[PDB]
Structure formats: structure tokens, C-alpha cells
Amino acid sequence: ETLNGGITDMLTELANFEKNVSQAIHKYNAYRKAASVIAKYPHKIKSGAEAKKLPGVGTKIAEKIDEFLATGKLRKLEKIRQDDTSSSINFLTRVSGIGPSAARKFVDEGIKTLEDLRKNEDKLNHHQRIGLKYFGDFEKRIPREEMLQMQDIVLNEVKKVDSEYIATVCGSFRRGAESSGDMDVLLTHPSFTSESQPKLLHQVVEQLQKVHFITDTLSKGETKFMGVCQLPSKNDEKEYPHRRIDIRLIPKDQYYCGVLYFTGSDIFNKNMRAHKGFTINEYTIRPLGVTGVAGEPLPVDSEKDIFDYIQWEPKDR
DNA sequence: GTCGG
DNA sequence: GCTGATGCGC
DNA sequence: CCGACGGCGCATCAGC
Ligand SMILES: *P(=O)(O)OC[C@@H]1O[C@H](n2ccc(N)nc2=O)CS1
Ligand code: NA
Ligand code: NA
Ligand code: NA
Ligand code: NA
Ligand code: NA
């Protein structure tokens, strides 16, 4: 599955410059679509024309592939990689909270590196400071073992605040994956429905700060919390990395739609979405009509009440 | 940049 | 001060 | 040729 990796690296490299430097998000997704269709292609590509056959690979990406195969490089990438301005803008967006627009502004003012960021705490907002502070940790994957320990803590403390909460760690983790990029937790409580927040999210966040699991807050409102956490390590062991954790308060009757959605995979979702006359979003499933007019959303008490309706487990996905 | 109305 | 627009992460 | 390409919660900015 690494058979066109040079081609795939190139395309992802091009993708990020469109996103972070050119600010062309559709070009970004075009290069990424092209990269992943190629990454799944079971042969070593020999020509751009061979690749052009795949959906998401067009004439310009096929030309690029021909230049890359003939020379092992792309003049445009070589060039843009040398460029002080653009390289810097690209790199700074790796800090969580620095998007393409903040990156450009910093580089305009001569702030180009992490050091530069450090020397100017004042010019960054809260999220950006936390992303700087944990820059290295956030780029690390989380082994399954550590996620299990993190899960242990979350369920214990959620249940302790109130035994009637229901919390589920979603993401790749729930799919059995050997590692994860962060922790996505979905939270509900029987007294929170589509027509209902009484500090339900807040008092959970607070409990996990109280036992020193949550260490920082990127953002926090009534339904979505974004922050940082860390496992305790014993007296004379090296610290675990700081880790990203999100917690979502969803109403009881949308939980399982939410669960499914944040369970992923992104691939299987977009897939089963289009796959019959039903439409699905993170919240609900609605039946259509003639034009395609969504009727009222259907009740749900489980994940598998949804595997009724298209005639369609997380292990697989 | 690629697709498709 | 308040409303809506934009930036951002995912 | 020429528009679609994803949408939503929170923080923060621009404007009144
Ligand atoms: P994060 O990287 O934790 O992804 C998990 C969930 O998937 C959904 N998702 C992923 C990527 C993007 N671009 N958009 C998106 O909605 C929601 S968070
Ligand atoms: Na641009
Ligand atoms: Na094609
Ligand atoms: Na960023
Ligand atoms: Na995730
Ligand atoms: Na992730």
C-alpha cells in the first residue's frame, strides 16, 4: 500500500500549500481525493495517463505525475519548498489554532518559526498558546493501551458525577484501532432531549479537571468542549504526552445518530449516507418524498434501529 | 483541480 | 453594548 | 463553459 508513495506524498504536499498558502480549500480537497484514490490503487503507476483513469485524477495531476516519474521531482514543489515566506506559512498552520489566515499575518510581521511564536506570546490567542505549548505532543499518536486508560478515567468520573449519564468514546478507538489521534467522547443524559444544559457538560468537565485529567481548555460551551488531558504517571516515570480530547453533550434521542457519526469511519459514513429513499445526518435519519422533501425524523433507541431502514459493527467500518 | 450539468 | 461574519478545528 | 465542492460549535473580529 506504499506503491505510489512518492506520488501520494507529492500530492499531499501540494494539497497543504493550496490549503495553507494559496487558501484554495477546493484545490486542497481535490489533491487529497486524488492522493487517496491513488493510495488505494493496487499497482505501481507507470504513466499519468494510467492514473488519469481514476476518478479525482484529471489532466493537471496526470501531467504532474509524468514529470515526477521522469525526474523524481516537481519543479513547482522544489520551488515552493525553498520559498521562505510560503514554507513558513505552511509550517505555522501546524500549530493548532493557527489557520491559513493567522499564519500569513504572522509571516507578514516576520514571525516565522516556533521560536518567533514563543517570543510573541502576546500576539496569540488562548487556543494558539495552548497549541504552541503542546505543539509536539499533539502531533503524536495515542496507543490503544493509553486510550483504554483514558477511557477508564472518563467513564469512572462521568458515572461519579451522575450515574445516569451515558458516555461513549467514539472515533477509530471504538473501531478497535491500535492507535488514535485524539479522544472523542459523546455524552448524554436522560433529562436532555431535543426539547430541553442544566450544566450537564460543565459539571463533567469540572470533575475531570478536579482529578487533574483535563489540564487545559481550548473552547467550551453548552454542547461542545475542546481541551487537553493527560494520564497520571507514577512518582518516578516519565510523563505521558498531553493529548487532545473533545466532549460532546448530545440529547438522548440523537445520541445514537451522533454515536454512529463520530464512530466513523469517514469513508464508511459518506458511503452509507448516499446508500433507497433515506437521508442521514449526525443528528437524524429522515425519509424523502417526490421532489426529495425530508419528512419528520424517526425515533432511535440504539445504533441498530438505523440498520433497519436501508436494509444495510464498528469492528468492520 | 476535477467533475459534470 | 449587540448582531452577524470570519477563522478555526474536525 | 461554469458552478459545486460540508456543515456546525465556539472564540473572536468588524461594524453599527
Ligand atoms: P477528528 O480528526 O477527531 O475527526 C473525528 C470526527 O469526524 C468528523 N469530521 C472529521 C473531519 C472533518 N473534516 N470533518 C468532520 O466533520 C467530525 S469530528
Ligand atoms: Na488564493
Ligand atoms: Na479521471
Ligand atoms: Na493550525
Ligand atoms: Na478523532
Ligand atoms: Na484525528
* CB distance A255 to A163 below 8 Å: no
**Shared domain check, A266 and A207:** no
Q: A194, A123, A201, A218: which is closest to A162 by C-alpha?
A: A201
Consecutive H or E run containing A179: strand A179-180
* CB distance A155 to A215 below 8 Å: no
Nearest ligand 1 atom, CA A182: 3
Q: Whose CA is nearest to atom 11 of ligand 1?
A: A266
Q: Which domain holds residue A75?
A: 1-83
Which nucleotide does the CA of A283 lie closest to, via C1'?
Answer: D8
Domain ends where: A140, A160, A175? Answer: A140
**Shared domain check, A242 and A159:** yes
Strand C: list protein residues with Cβ under 7 Å. Answer: A 93, 95-103, 127, 131, 182, 184, 244, 246
Tally of domains within chain A: 4
Task: Please return the burial class of A72, using the count of CB atoms within 10 Å of its CB with bins 0-12, 13-18 and 19+.
Answer: exposed
Q: Which residue has the cell 481535490?
A: A30
Resolution in A: 2.5
Nearest ligand 1 atom, CA A262: 6
**Shared domain check, A224 and A120:** no
- Domain with residue A109: its CATH number is 1.10.150.20
Q: How far is the CA of A220 from the C1' of C2 (A)?
A: 21
Consecutive H or E run containing A214: strand A214-220
- In this complex, the answer to whether residue A42 has its CB under 7 A from any atom of chain B, a nucleic strand, is no
C-alpha–C-alpha distance, residues A278 and A280, integer Å: 7
Ligand nearest to the CA of A30: 3
| Cα radius of gyration rounded to whole Å, chain A | 23
- Sign of the CA dihedral with A91 first, then A96, A100, and A104 last: negative
* Residue A148 in grid coordinates: 483504554
C-alpha–C-alpha distance, residues A121 and A123, integer Å: 6
DSSP codes joined into one string, A54-68: STT--HHHHHHHHHH
**Shared domain check, A51 and A95:** no
